[PDB]
Amino acid sequence: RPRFSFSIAAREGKARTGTIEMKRGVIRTPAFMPVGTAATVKALKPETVRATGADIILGNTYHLMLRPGAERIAKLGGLHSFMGWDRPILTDSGGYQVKQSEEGVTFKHMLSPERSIEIQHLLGSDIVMAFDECTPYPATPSRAASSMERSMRWAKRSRDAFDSRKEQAENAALFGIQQGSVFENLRQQSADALAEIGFDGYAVGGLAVGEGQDEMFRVLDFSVPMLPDDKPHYLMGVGKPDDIVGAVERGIDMFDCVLPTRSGRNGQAFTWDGPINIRNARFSEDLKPLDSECHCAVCQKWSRAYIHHLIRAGEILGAMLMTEHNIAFYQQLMQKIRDSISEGRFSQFAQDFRARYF
Amino acid sequence: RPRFSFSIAAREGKARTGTIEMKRGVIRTPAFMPVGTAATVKALKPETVRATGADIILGNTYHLMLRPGAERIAKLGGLHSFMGWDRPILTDSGGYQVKQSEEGVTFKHMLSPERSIEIQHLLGSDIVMAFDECTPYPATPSRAASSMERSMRWAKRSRDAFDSRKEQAENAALFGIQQGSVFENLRQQSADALAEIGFDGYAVGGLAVGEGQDEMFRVLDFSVPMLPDDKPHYLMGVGKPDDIVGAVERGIDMFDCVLPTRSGRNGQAFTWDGPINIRNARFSEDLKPLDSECHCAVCQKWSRAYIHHLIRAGEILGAMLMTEHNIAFYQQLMQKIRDSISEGRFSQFAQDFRARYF
Ligand SMILES: CNc1nc2cc3nc[nH]c(=O)c3cc2[nH]1
Ligand SMILES: CNc1nc2cc3nc[nH]c(=O)c3cc2[nH]1
Ligand SMILES: [Zn+2]
Ligand SMILES: [Zn+2]
């Protein structure tokens, strides 16, 4: 397999379906990446994660740079070996979860573009995120521009730190991140700068930070066409199933979110009829599975009623089952999306989905 | 399969190895029963429990009689269907975890022999425990005798409540429980009363309540020979691996304990070299599996170092992996015990085990 090769197999409007080939495996796009916070996709064995259909996971950098520390994980053979996931891993830069200066950030420890790229290397990341600044929402145009310009400078620093490590450069990919808040001209200048630097992929940063779905979609409308067509488009931190469907309709290829895991643990189950909270007393004697159509193992063997009991009782198996279901649901969503694009009926899928989901 | 048939295949001294055949499956003896507290073996899917080698589990009655309630579980199809374990289940009487009278116990609700047997029926238990009184330790001879006599009266009540329900009588088994504290004459009178009533199996109650291993073994020395030879002997709530080995040497066939699950969750891993606490910093970079010889999936794929990280971080996968390992270890212990008895080298196994374990 090549280091990185993104190929688009089919299109419908702005939507695309295809594959990213990497040394550690193939990634079907549009892709959902389950989130590994501290070297684990919470409450799931990696083989379970794979079984749900995930091709790649996101490893959070922030907690692991703390403990056990990037250097220790490197000593132990890297993140893949440590956690037992042998397929691609996208690592974030660790800066989003974190004294600000042009050099980088210091916190209660200094994190700069260079250190970030180094930590992602020590972890053995397949897809490395440039180190940026996620502009708070709302932002004045001046602040958004200052923030964006700093991010582009840090993007160039990222690129050069990555490229100055031959094993990283040869075996991993680097994604750049677009900023600009909700301002079209800043988004354009940022797309321009990132393309000039050149990356393997382009994320749309700065969204899903409180602007709400209408505003996010309005920004995506003009921002995604500004990115190189021939590379993957990653919408960081999104999101709800409906967010994902609209974002694919606007050209996004990749997604990550804690919603399916975190909200699973809290009792929220995704269904094609919309989300349910399994702790509600209405499920105490409901022998139906979480969802009527879901093909996951949880829906094949256990009832709402049992999972209701488990979550109410604080039992770990409740977290395990809810999470497996929710990640499986997300993967089934992405599969339906890929299939519908491949078959030229994605617009109809999107309408049908929303009608039933709501 | 018959309702209940215990057959002894081999002996060495007081030790026995054999099988209990029941409608829902075969139980290899000496047997360890993982504990299901509230319709779950904590942090494990039933298929994982089975995979470790368990033939039967113990379902705690106390929490489930609370919520969801025995009646609701019966409505939902019984405990086996609810939790997804289709093999035998031994249910306790619910009284041990719980205003005392000859009628039964009231608590913050009244539990009597009759209600207990009824709840175990509603749950659909394969092996039903008579409702007793576990005499506190230490106990004066007068108190121990009063307690024991009450338990024998409740044992007769148990027997008759069980027998007065035809589907229970036809499809499940009933075990009686011996009391008498540490007094040989009371233990004898209790064995006598239980045999006169007649049960499918006989538990040694009243131990593992603070008397310590020497005293427990001294009591077992005289108490187990008092029970019918041709029925299984169950030592309730035991125990540590060394406790189990000595108890088999004294004629016990069945065991349950929360140590492997509960202590697993707390960081304690059982090894043939003795238990370890994985949170100790000595394991932070130890790439060895929990145990050098263990055949479990956890030891096949993950390091001490990773599990160390997981437990320190409070991650659910840490509970999952520690528990699977520990239950697998317990099952491997019982297998070694069965094999050594079958081969007439159990006494040597016991010595070798203790030498290395300590
Ligand atoms: C959950 N929403 C959300 N998670 C994000 C992570 C991010 N990382 C780097 N850069 C970002 O702009 C950024 C924006 C984000 N929004
Ligand atoms: C953990 N020790 C322990 N768990 C027990 C459960 C019991 N149940 C019924 N009757 C008992 O005598 C009894 C004794 C016990 N000791
Ligand atoms: Zn499902
Ligand atoms: Zn093991």
From Swiss-Prot, chains A, B:
InterPro entries: ArchSynthase1/Queuine_TRR, TGT, TGT-like_sf, tRNA_ribo_trans-like. Its cofactor is Zn(2+). GO terms for biological process: queuosine biosynthetic process; tRNA wobble guanine modification; tRNA-guanine transglycosylation. One of its GO terms (cellular component) is cytosol. It comes from the Bacteria. Its EC number is 2.4.2.29. It is an enzyme of class 2 (transferase). Substrate binds at residues 92-96, 132, 179, 206. It holds the Pfam family TGT. Binds 1 zinc ion per subunit. Homodimer. Within each dimer, one monomer is responsible for RNA recognition and catalysis, while the other monomer binds to the replacement base PreQ1. This is Queuine tRNA-ribosyltransferase. It comes from Zymomonas mobilis subsp. mobilis (strain ATCC 31821 / ZM4 / CP4). The lineage of its organism: Bacteria, Pseudomonadati, Pseudomonadota, Alphaproteobacteria, Sphingomonadales. The gene is tgt.
